[PDB]
Design an enzyme around this catalytic site. Structure first.
Site, PDB file in Angstrom:
ATOM      1  N   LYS A 125       2.566   1.917   7.301  1.00  0.00           N
ATOM      2  CA  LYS A 125       3.178   1.138   8.392  1.00  0.00           C
ATOM      3  C   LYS A 125       4.092   1.965   9.264  1.00  0.00           C
ATOM      4  O   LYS A 125       4.432   3.077   8.940  1.00  0.00           O
ATOM      5  CB  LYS A 125       4.012  -0.004   7.820  1.00  0.00           C
ATOM      6  CG  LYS A 125       3.211  -1.074   7.210  1.00  0.00           C
ATOM      7  CD  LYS A 125       1.821  -1.083   7.804  1.00  0.00           C
ATOM      8  CE  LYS A 125       1.679  -2.212   8.810  1.00  0.00           C
ATOM      9  NZ  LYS A 125       0.621  -1.933   9.821  1.00  0.00           N
ATOM     10  N   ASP A 137      -3.279 -11.936  14.737  1.00  0.00           N
ATOM     11  CA  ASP A 137      -2.122 -11.184  15.243  1.00  0.00           C
ATOM     12  C   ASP A 137      -2.307 -10.510  16.625  1.00  0.00           C
ATOM     13  O   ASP A 137      -1.342 -10.041  17.237  1.00  0.00           O
ATOM     14  CB  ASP A 137      -1.565 -10.217  14.170  1.00  0.00           C
ATOM     15  CG  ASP A 137      -2.483  -9.029  13.893  1.00  0.00           C
ATOM     16  OD1 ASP A 137      -3.729  -9.155  14.071  1.00  0.00           O
ATOM     17  OD2 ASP A 137      -1.949  -7.985  13.439  1.00  0.00           O
ATOM     18  N   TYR A 146       0.190   4.067  10.773  1.00  0.00           N
ATOM     19  CA  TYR A 146      -0.215   3.076  11.766  1.00  0.00           C
ATOM     20  C   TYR A 146       1.065   2.786  12.578  1.00  0.00           C
ATOM     21  O   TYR A 146       2.084   2.420  12.005  1.00  0.00           O
ATOM     22  CB  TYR A 146      -0.627   1.778  11.097  1.00  0.00           C
ATOM     23  CG  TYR A 146      -2.022   1.751  10.571  1.00  0.00           C
ATOM     24  CD1 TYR A 146      -3.115   1.985  11.399  1.00  0.00           C
ATOM     25  CD2 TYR A 146      -2.256   1.446   9.242  1.00  0.00           C
ATOM     26  CE1 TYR A 146      -4.429   1.967  10.876  1.00  0.00           C
ATOM     27  CE2 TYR A 146      -3.545   1.383   8.722  1.00  0.00           C
ATOM     28  CZ  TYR A 146      -4.626   1.638   9.529  1.00  0.00           C
ATOM     29  OH  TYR A 146      -5.893   1.559   8.974  1.00  0.00           O
ATOM     30  N   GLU A 187      -4.518   4.325  14.218  1.00  0.00           N
ATOM     31  CA  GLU A 187      -5.325   3.443  15.022  1.00  0.00           C
ATOM     32  C   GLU A 187      -5.824   3.982  16.348  1.00  0.00           C
ATOM     33  O   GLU A 187      -6.623   3.321  17.007  1.00  0.00           O
ATOM     34  CB  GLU A 187      -4.660   2.067  15.174  1.00  0.00           C
ATOM     35  CG  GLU A 187      -3.494   2.015  16.206  1.00  0.00           C
ATOM     36  CD  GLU A 187      -2.121   2.564  15.678  1.00  0.00           C
ATOM     37  OE1 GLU A 187      -2.065   3.057  14.536  1.00  0.00           O
ATOM     38  OE2 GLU A 187      -1.102   2.504  16.436  1.00  0.00           O
ATOM     39  N   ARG A 196       0.826  -1.160   0.000  1.00  0.00           N
ATOM     40  CA  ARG A 196       0.000   0.000   0.000  1.00  0.00           C
ATOM     41  C   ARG A 196       0.881   1.238   0.000  1.00  0.00           C
ATOM     42  O   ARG A 196       2.109   1.134   0.066  1.00  0.00           O
ATOM     43  CB  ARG A 196      -0.964  -0.033   1.178  1.00  0.00           C
ATOM     44  CG  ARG A 196      -1.988  -1.188   1.092  1.00  0.00           C
ATOM     45  CD  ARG A 196      -2.753  -1.271   2.390  1.00  0.00           C
ATOM     46  NE  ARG A 196      -1.859  -1.802   3.413  1.00  0.00           N
ATOM     47  CZ  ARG A 196      -2.189  -2.077   4.666  1.00  0.00           C
ATOM     48  NH1 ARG A 196      -3.412  -1.845   5.129  1.00  0.00           N
ATOM     49  NH2 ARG A 196      -1.269  -2.556   5.472  1.00  0.00           N
ATOM     50  N   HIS A 208       1.136   1.261  16.355  1.00  0.00           N
ATOM     51  CA  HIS A 208       1.061   0.089  17.238  1.00  0.00           C
ATOM     52  C   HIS A 208       2.228   0.111  18.239  1.00  0.00           C
ATOM     53  O   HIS A 208       2.957  -0.868  18.396  1.00  0.00           O
ATOM     54  CB  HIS A 208       1.077  -1.224  16.403  1.00  0.00           C
ATOM     55  CG  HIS A 208      -0.133  -1.394  15.529  1.00  0.00           C
ATOM     56  ND1 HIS A 208      -1.414  -1.440  16.037  1.00  0.00           N
ATOM     57  CD2 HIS A 208      -0.260  -1.481  14.183  1.00  0.00           C
ATOM     58  CE1 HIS A 208      -2.278  -1.568  15.043  1.00  0.00           C
ATOM     59  NE2 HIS A 208      -1.606  -1.572  13.907  1.00  0.00           N
TER      60      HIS A 208
END
Lengths: 361, 361, 361, 361, 361
Positions: E74, E269, E93, E117, E15, E95
């Protein structure tokens, strides 16, 4: 209370303030209603129909205006200025932010004027406009189909096509009430349909209505350009209910459309998202620009007065009854109604209208 | 072979004998096509579109008529009588049983004339009429909706209604192709629909299409009277393709309909099932009888020439190609085509037309 | 905790407080459950089914009532008055505002009694009644169909009709949960359906469920009269959950219905919108008035105990578990549960019930 | 009779001649069945499953081939040539017009060989091929979706898209059984779908299945070019069951497709309508040409042996039983079966195969 | 402002932070965008596509990272640690609760990092995750179908079956967004579908989407056991977005499934409701346990980068623009954005991440 219903005198206005069913309900509540003869005729309601409901049919407008409550569809016109009275309750569509004189006029007289279009819920929904918006969305496709006919000016395309032949392509800009009702009709005729909107949540909700039958696209200039260029029928459904919509469709884009394509913009009288589109008259409803037919006649719901009158009444009714019962106190029991108040006792009470006539406040 | 396509000259005829896609196919088969400039323009096909397909665009009708095969939509008119040639193949809609002079005319000249409307299958289906019937069924509802609008003359009823308000009632007399296509559009707009037919098997088949969404009723005078009296839009769809339909709707019944109701009869130019209905002109498409609007303009498919031309071509195409390839032998290889033959070598060959001009045989 | 499930002893009550699946869940949470033998049998659950789930099957009601928590469907009856204990938690449908003695009874004993029907959400939704309302809406059409059969008393009409024959007409008064579930079944059988409601927003929402398949009409006396007069099956679905509904259907209107028509009112035991309708017994479920069949047996969901027991449990379950875990503290952690509390420590705590037995407070 | 079912030995063939249900039926008719151990395992049927049905499970192919009737899926392979016997009835898919040696082989031995693929009805329908065609149509979309995934080689397009994003475009060439089943799956995933066909009647029939949800287009070079150029997934579904299809898609057209687009042609092993497409192996199922992914693995139904075996049996069953009962006489009682006869008594009986091996006749 | 878009370097990430349409919009707002050459290529966007939109295409990542705002998909990887700059705005994103080092890293540098997120609405909805959840639900069925194919490892079952043959059974655990999207695809392929959920309101809402086509079941251990045992495809759709889901499917239950059945858990995940399921790699995406195929590759949306990039952009766009306009002030004008803030000025601001690295706070 005594409630009067004069005949609408505005040009091409065929609706009527109260239908026979509404009358019957009001009468069953102890109220008395006076309706000017022929008032319902354009909507398909004869005087007898009013008589069977409990109305007293009056021979003149004067007789209808001389009541404590006047329930109408359109705003009063100069011709009626001298029929208004001091302590009246007037309930109809006003649109004061566009009529200085009317506003002044109502101020002089002193009556209290409640506008359908400002009665507002906590959600900021306008329950008394919606009925008309729904009808307008549905008619947009009906009109559009008529203008795609060769004799009417369009390229001569059948929306649904026939097996073996390409169906028409309908592009709808705006996924709200209007655009949604338009998509329903277009899908019903068998057309290929695209709806654009900038709110993904709305797009998501629409998928629950249409499944994969309609293309649901995010409104971005790039996609808009492509879609519009391939459209047979473009429908502007961005009804931003106070001030104008942005131009989603510039003349440059219109120049890229096929000849015989048709454009309908529900936002015409307020300002559309289509650069080239302006209001037109009934006698000359459309005009061409780049070979693209433009339909700009406003107030589409006026084409179906029988259906429109009932739809409106279904929504105004509970308010009419409250007013008839509690008179002015209803404004202290009803917040929505309170919000509908525009003029009272010679003062301009509506915040949005003040903002327009700051020196009128 | 050389194939010519003159521009249609009949009043209000905008379709064209061959579309660009058709041309391209014919050309790819080794044939050459000559098309009169502007011939496709009313249907939305420009000369360039014909050029890209392989056609030679001709400046005059003479140049288009001077070919071995002439492919048209309508019958030749007097003005074109002198353009016809002795050994031509003419393929178009003729309707000879209504035109003595044309018939004689074609007889004088000697060409072979194949009528679209008589090319017949073993099933006695007329594959070259059906496309137009489908379109006519679909348009009936589109026109009907327009005439139910107040400004157009009707009571001002929105077919689909709006939640809370009664939808329009559409009554369709005849459950064949036409009536079925009409029901599809009416259901699509949200109307309440009733279809009447005398063939229960057909009614049964229709249930597989519509489920319980449409009322499927056996045609009996009693039920017909009730239904029709409550109709907003009555659609006559009994197209008995040779001779006239019986009157299912007598004036007495029409007098019982609501004022502002509308009637459309697809069988108008042949004879309808509605007593009061007769043909009208484009300039004055409707008339009232008992306050009921009558729309009687014939050839509804002419309103959508872009869609109609392709639909027709999709069906005529394989025949045009056969003729181009095998010339006259195709009539001995093709039974349907053989049945389409009306005139040849000065003789009137069509059995049904002979029956009409028994002294022409 | 120990939870007991006695067999329902009320006449014609076949449901059971906990199904086997529920038991299994409770047991997996460390709780122990005692169920009176045969308790589940009317709902289709055998004792073994309870055994496999982890329940101890008890031979007597006494053994089931002697637990800290009693989970039931109906209210305790006099016969069981002596089985109740001081510190119990009782969870079932009570309807105290209709039972002085039961109320007093529960007060004497001292237990805490939580009523399913008063456990209330912030939305003022009653999550533990809804399951039954849904079932009742669905059954209304099933019963109505049975009574339209000639041998059962009705005119002998098949709801769906057959192609060529008129389908039955179902008129539903009330567009809430009950009326919506009824419309689903009626549409499923192929009937022609009309739903009336006074809330246009609700009507609008219903259109998203049914599209144009059902007629969505605003509840006004005028339209109601016409519709009802033509109905084969009239369904009263105005369940105003505290006090009674207004009469939407007066005897005078009933007299206007066709002979053999049927009326079902889901609001019967509370007070319907149909003047002529009163409760009946299982042995004589219907009666005629003007040749119109009236069905007045209450508690329709009791006809399908297998389905009803699970539906109820799916909703009560999370509450039963909370109570089993936190005992009385759950009422301070759960507002809905807190609202379900009716009686505790000899006091009548429920505000609505106090209002009924003001001297009981 | 004794019927044997050997395990399929062809590479990647997992189906089996008879399923357990079929066995059970045959056994209930007095016949005895011998099946080679593990024969059903690739299709999900264990030997026990065969035992419970009444089969005797045999340890070797020899034991399965040594029966009066051998029921298989694929043609016998050389390895099995020595297992065949003189008076056997062999029933399976043969495809003799492609296997001289097999044909000769069967001729030497003398058995009677009935091919599934030639059993033909009066309609010239091949009832024993259809089941596989249906499955192949359904899988085409499943495979196509997998190859549109980025890691698999495609552009990485989700067929259904998501609200706000363009769905994938699936173009299907051929509106018969295969193309129709493919359209069903594509519509199910939410894609935009176009089906092309040259038969308008078929297009018309398809509209009764899909309504306006799918675009139904007449197959003309012009429209084909445009559509294909915009396709994400192109599916060749012109299965002309004797000889090859014409090229509807030439390399020049393929060069015009987007990179990452995918092509699947159900007609691959017979000859497709896509110029660039040829058969591939399981180990390397696809290849690119112009950045367009080509999938050419044949016998798609072999991917779902559990489903395929039952589908086949549902159709072969009644024939297997007839043969078991009437042995060779069934060919004189059954015309379809008679047509399935390919080889008997050393003679090549099949007219179409003779035509191929004219010197074999 | 200057906005840079580096190429994603994470393995198998195709992406891209901004699509061409997004770029065009940003540029039209006065902002300038720099994109690393080839950045869009895996998603199907060529550099020219970026050029036509107004982007300056940069030759290196350094050139893309050196901007005031970096928009990515990412999290930054070590390789890029030295490309980050002090006063940057980073939007992607992250995390962080799973990456101590990255967290520390971002802290060292000092930039402000906004995580997609955590951008949260008042409803506690995460508008920037949903798009991916929808895609994941849709793909679950697409993958599951592929693994039910014999060559892929499954029993070889066609989900839709064929008339006469049992369709596949799909059991979905979880009725939220993911499970709902999965049910849509499964129903589309023709499978028999069951959805389990513990929220009856949700079950009720689902019935408005699916009617009676799908089985809507309350999640209780008992029913779960039965259903799962009969499943061909089991889909875990309980995505509890912070911490892990409970085990709804224990190994003991898995052992009861049919051989060749397939399991897909969207929650892999994070931790699934299926005991036996763990993450797998692209090179070895599945594994068997009890003959049941397990697919455990995470980030399903990465399979359709073209569709996923647009879906993401449609949602991030309005935020990117706000940030570009108001820079850091947007966090005081936007509460959702404020909630997305994770790190700023060397401090770890995100409450949930602090809780994870309490000593980092």
């Amino acid at each position: 209370m005594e409630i009067g219903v004069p005949k609408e005198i505005k040009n091409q206005e065929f609706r009527v303030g109260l239908s026979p069913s509404s009358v019957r309900t009001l009468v069953e509540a102890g109220h008395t209603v006076f309706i000017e003869t022929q008032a319902g005729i354009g909507a398909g309601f004869a005087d007898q129909d009013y008589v069977q409901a409990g109305a007293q049919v009056v021979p003149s407008a004067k007789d209808a205006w001389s009541r404590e409550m006047v329930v109408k569809v359109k705003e009063p016109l100069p011709a009626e200025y001298d029929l208004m009275q001091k302590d009246q309750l007037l309930f109809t569509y006003l649109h004061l932010a566009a009529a200085r004189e009317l506003t002044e006029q109502l101020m002089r007289v002193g009556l209290t004027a409640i506008a359908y279009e400002t009665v507002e819920l906590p959600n900021r929904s306008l329950p008394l406009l919606t009925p008309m918006s729904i009808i307008a969305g549905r008619l947009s496709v009906q009109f559009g189909a008529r203008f795609l006919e060769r004799q009417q000016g369009g390229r001569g395309v059948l929306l649904g096509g026939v097996p073996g032949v390409k169906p028409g392509k309908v592009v709808i800009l705006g996924g709200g009430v209007v655009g949604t009702e338009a998509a329903k009709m277009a899908v019903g005729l068998g057309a290929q349909v695209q709806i654009f909107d900038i709110n993904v949540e709305r797009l998501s909700y629409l998928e629950t209505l249409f499944g994969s039958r309609v293309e649901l696209l995010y409104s971005n200039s790039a996609e808009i350009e492509t879609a519009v260029a391939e459209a047979d029928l473009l429908i502007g459904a961005v009804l931003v209910p106070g001030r104008r919509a942005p131009i989603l469709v510039p003349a440059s884009l219109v120049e890229q459309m096929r000849t015989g394509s048709v454009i309908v913009d529900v936002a015409v009288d307020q300002g559309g998202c289509v650069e080239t589109l302006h209001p037109t008259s009934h006698t000359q409803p459309t005009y061409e620009v780049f070979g693209v037919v433009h339909y700009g006649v406003p107030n589409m719901p006026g084409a179906v007065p029988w259906t429109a009158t009932q739809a409106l009444n279904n929504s105004t009714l509970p308010y009419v009854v409250k007013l008839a019962n509690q008179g002015l106190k209803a404004l202290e029991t009803d917040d929505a109604l309170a919000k509908g108040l525009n003029v009272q006792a010679h003062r301009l009470v509506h915040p949005a209208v003040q903002q327009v006539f700051p020196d009128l406040a």
